[PDB]
Design a binder for this molecule. Structure first.
Ligand SMILES: *C(=N)[C@H](C[C@@H]1CCNC1=O)NC(=O)[C@@H]1C[C@@H](C(F)(F)F)CN1C(=O)[C@@H](NC(=O)OC)C(C)(C)C
Ligand SMILES: *C(=N)[C@H](C[C@@H]1CCNC1=O)NC(=O)[C@@H]1C[C@@H](C(F)(F)F)CN1C(=O)[C@@H](NC(=O)OC)C(C)(C)C
Lengths: 305, 300
């Protein structure tokens, strides 16, 4: 029993973290086989950030301008190239600690673990959901760029995120491992607005099932609702519209507790209109939306890697 | 910017997790040098648990009744001894992945990372605080016993907790790595009550500093308070009394922000008396007490 925000064990990702220095900028790099991936803004000076021409900036750099350090040993850069917003530095040594991996582009609503790093040394691990407006609510300071987001499938690490910048709301933005930003953001220090955020309805439903499995039952009522009727309420409270795909994804949890998805939607519908009235659910005074139906199932089956 | 409940990187501890089986019971063990540490209740049947005589039960077990596995490698058990509520299994191989380590008994109010494990394999990592009543609010299922709590200081792993059981209220109990339970608990399946819990006042203040460093400042008022008057209010709302030692520990945060501890206690006094009025601090609708001043400084 008990329900907690839990991150994947970071060991396999810790063995891939290196420090990448160019000029006065020092950030983190991901060393897989004989390539070190890092954000391309590492080649900028504080002034360049305002409006960089990355192609021209990279032309002025050579392999000797990139100081790559794996622990106490310096790695030699023998080639460099730019793939979207990512810099790929070829090194002369392949990472002997390279795990089985893949590069994946996650969807909004999906979660991942972030291994926050500074000077190529891991400092902490936490779980994030990719918000519907393609930002993340992380904890990142100067030097944290190049820190990666990932999920594990027993043996294989699916790298889905690399940290690049922080936006007005204190929210974070970054790319997949091919350098394509999530959202409408650019790696330039100019004002940029993230869209209006929305609550991940399917994740709130998943978390209400986790509450039932754990003994928190007070919010359960005898009503049901239509996917269409519920969406009229969800739109008023800024919740993402619920689809049949979402209902099918929630099937395993619904089957385990014997509570139908439309029945849980009716319980959620009343929680949005009447509020929680000072009561808590799983130790929280708000409705949580950063647990996927898969995060809940994993923590209700003991899935190991 | 951003403030998150963050666990330490688990790689160093993952290399120490092994599977320990005794009869039909399978749980986790901690392999450091040539010794595997695990809960002593691994030797119990579902029947023994109700009222175990561990001394008599362990007498009936030999080294061969303990199967220890690290990955697909079988470690040969060549010795066994019981220290308090912990079993120490001597194996024929020293763990080559043994980090620099120490065993620590943490104080109530302090935090640690838990590497949750099943079948000797790591499942996930989360941060916990040892409550004033010596329980933790974890996420542990059947087979999670043996999973450990730890802190990391650069290269050294300070192991502070080993999971043993779940209490009537859904909370968790366990021992330090010497087998001594935190709190009044015993490894027997009988009803046991954890005391009335209290809020960790020094941690709530550290979290208020974290909020100000992040731009959440609506709760900051122009008032100040004394230690004696703040403690009169804190007593009413079931908070631990704030001491000069607590004020001293808040020093680095107080200096980094330029906000006196007694000015922050006036903000906290008004938050307790008037309530939060549906507002949030760092995305939370309640006052959080599971971040120590050190946890906050580490992320600021
Ligand atoms: C990477 N090491 C940092 C991480 C950043 C530091 C403060 N909080 C964080 O998360 N990344 C940067 O400093 C980027 C690099 C520049 C750019 F993104 F390429 F343009 C600007 N940086 C920013 O994050 C800026 N954000 C911004 O311009 O967003 C539009 C700020 C935070 C203003 C320095
Ligand atoms: C260890 N693998 C489990 C962990 C437990 C299972 C569900 N969630 C958990 O935290 N530990 C146990 O099953 C212990 C072993 C027995 C004893 F502690 F040695 F006595 C009893 N177990 C319990 O946790 C029981 N709790 C209990 O009796 O508390 C007083 C329960 C959870 C009732 C099986």
């Amino acid at each position: 029993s008990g329900f907690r925000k839990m991150a994947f064990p970071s060991g396999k990702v810790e063995g891939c973290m290196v420090q990448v220095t160019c000029g006065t900028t020092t950030l983190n790099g991901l060393w897989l086989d004989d390539v070190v991936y890092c954000p391309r803004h590492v080649i900028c000076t504080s002034e360049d950030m305002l409006n960089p021409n990355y192609e021209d900036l990279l032309i002025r750099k050579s392999n000797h301008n990139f100081l790559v350090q794996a622990g106490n040993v310096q790695l030699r850069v023998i080639g460099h190239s730019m793939q979207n917003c990512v810099l790929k530095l070829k090194v002369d040594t392949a990472n002997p600690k390279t795990p089985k991996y893949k590069f994946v582009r996650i969807q909004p609503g999906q979660t991942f673990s972030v291994l926050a790093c500074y000077n190529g040394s891991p400092s902490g691990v936490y779980q994030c959901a990719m918000r519907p407006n393609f930002t993340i609510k992380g904890s990142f300071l100067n030097g944290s760029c190049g820190s990666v987001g990932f999920n594990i499938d027993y043996d294989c690490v699916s790298f889905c995120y690399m940290h690049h910048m922080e936006l007005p709301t204190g929210v974070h933005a970054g790319t997949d491992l091919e350098g394509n930003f999530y959202g409408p953001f650019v790696d330039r220090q100019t004002a940029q607005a993230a869209g209006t955020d929305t609550t991940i309805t399917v994740n709130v439903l998943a978390w209400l099932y986790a509450a039932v499995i754990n003994g928190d039952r007070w919010f359960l009522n005898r009503f049901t609702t239509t996917l269409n009727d519920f969406n009229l309420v969800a739109m008023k409270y800024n919740y993402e519209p619920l689809t049949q795909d979402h209902v099918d994804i929630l099937g395993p949890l619904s089957a385990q507790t014997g509570i139908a998805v439309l029945d849980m939607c009716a319980s959620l519908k009343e929680l949005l209109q009447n509020g929680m009235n000072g009561r808590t659910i799983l130790g929280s005074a708000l409705l949580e939306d950063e647990f996927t139906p898969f995060d809940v199932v994993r923590q209700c089956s003991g899935v190991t890697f």
